[PDB]
Design a protein around this ligand. Structure first.
Ligand SMILES: [Ca+2]
Ligand SMILES: [Ca+2]
Ligand SMILES: [Ca+2]
Ligand SMILES: [Ca+2]
Ligand SMILES: [Zn+2]
Length: 316
């Protein structure tokens, strides 16, 4: 829409109050003109037709419970755009400020959220397994990172390359959660998963086996479900990335942590300059080692820690 940029106020899924960038033109729309070519939030009104209608509101105040998922989809897309811009100097997901669009209230009782190749889509959850998925900043950033991957390495969504694609989304989803300093941790989806149980999450990067995912290459899933285990075998890479950052001893192999910041620079470089659509775990290890080498020198502690971490999860 063409109109005047302004700032509205609302409440997210978890009840927190936040300011959001809106546009006025008769109605106030969830359209943020301050980031790239814009961030646009749509109402899919419980249908599966996309994108739905750009979200329009009469008084620029978004405190209705129907508003909550839109508030957080719109706000957390902005935080994720800021992370990529300020930390990695990348303007939006294509690197040229593409507009970011999201639809919320997709379908009924839909327990998932996803990047479809053109925009983000968020279910409201069934209220038992999940609450509206845009309330999780790691989920939002995980999904928006698939758009970055799609425009850069182009990892296909199956077998080892799909598992890398998923882990790269958990890694940067976590880094965004730390960047916003929103009670950060190494778990995925803990703010929106099972409202009735405290302390769990969908997946864990620090201990993937707590939820039954593999934490070592010898435990990888070899069957056909989940497109060859893309959500399961991502645990092996997630554990490696947690060790590079935080350090630890895993299956008797000791890793000196180098921190989150360097973790993000190594993996962003590996993703945008050395990964290809069919890269496997062994090629990811080579890419991460070469990236660390480029940035810190072949005899740095950073290169040594990337090697130990892949050794610890059995990836040669
Ligand atoms: Ca209103
Ligand atoms: Ca958290
Ligand atoms: Ca988290
Ligand atoms: Ca829970
Ligand atoms: Zn994913």
């Amino acid at each position: 829409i063409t109109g005047t940029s302004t700032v509205g106020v609302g409440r997210g899924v978890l009840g927190d109050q936040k300011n959001i960038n809106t546009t006025y033109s008769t109605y106030y729309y969830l359209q943020d003109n301050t980031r790239g070519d814009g961030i646009f939030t749509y109402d899919a009104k419980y249908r599966t037709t996309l994108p739905g209608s750009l979200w329009a509101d009469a008084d620029n105040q978004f405190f209705a419970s129907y508003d909550a998922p839109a508030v957080d989809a719109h706000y957390y897309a902005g935080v994720t755009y800021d992370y990529y811009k300020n930390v990695h100097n990348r303007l939006s997901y294509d690197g040229n400020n593409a507009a970011i669009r999201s639809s919320v209230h997709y379908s009924q009782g839909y327990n998932n959220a996803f990047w479809n190749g053109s925009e983000m889509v968020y279910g409201d959850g069934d209220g038992q397994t999940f609450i509206p998925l845009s309330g999780g900043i790691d989920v939002v950033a995980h999904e928006l990172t698939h758009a970055v991957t799609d425009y850069t390495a182009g990892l296909i969504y199956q077998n080892e390359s799909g598992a890398i694609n998923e882990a790269i989304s958990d890694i940067f989803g976590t880094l965004v959660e730390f960047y916003a300093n929103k009670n950060p941790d190494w778990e995925i989806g803990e703010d929106v998963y099972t409202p009735g149980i405290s302390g769990d999450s969908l997946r864990s990067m620090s201990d993937p086996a707590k939820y039954g995912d593999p934490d070592h290459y010898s435990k990888r899933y070899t069957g056909t479900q989940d497109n060859g285990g893309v959500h399961i075998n991502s645990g092996i890479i997630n554990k490696a990335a947690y060790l590079i950052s935080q350090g630890g001893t895993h299956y008797g192999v000791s890793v000196v942590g180098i921190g989150r910041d360097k973790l993000g620079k190594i993996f962003y470089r590996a993703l945008t300059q050395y990964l290809t659509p069919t890269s496997n775990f062994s090629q990811l290890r080579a890419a991460a080692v070469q990236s660390a080498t480029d940035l810190y020198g072949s005899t740095s502690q950073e290169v040594a820690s990337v090697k130990q971490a892949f050794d610890a999860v059995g990836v040669k």
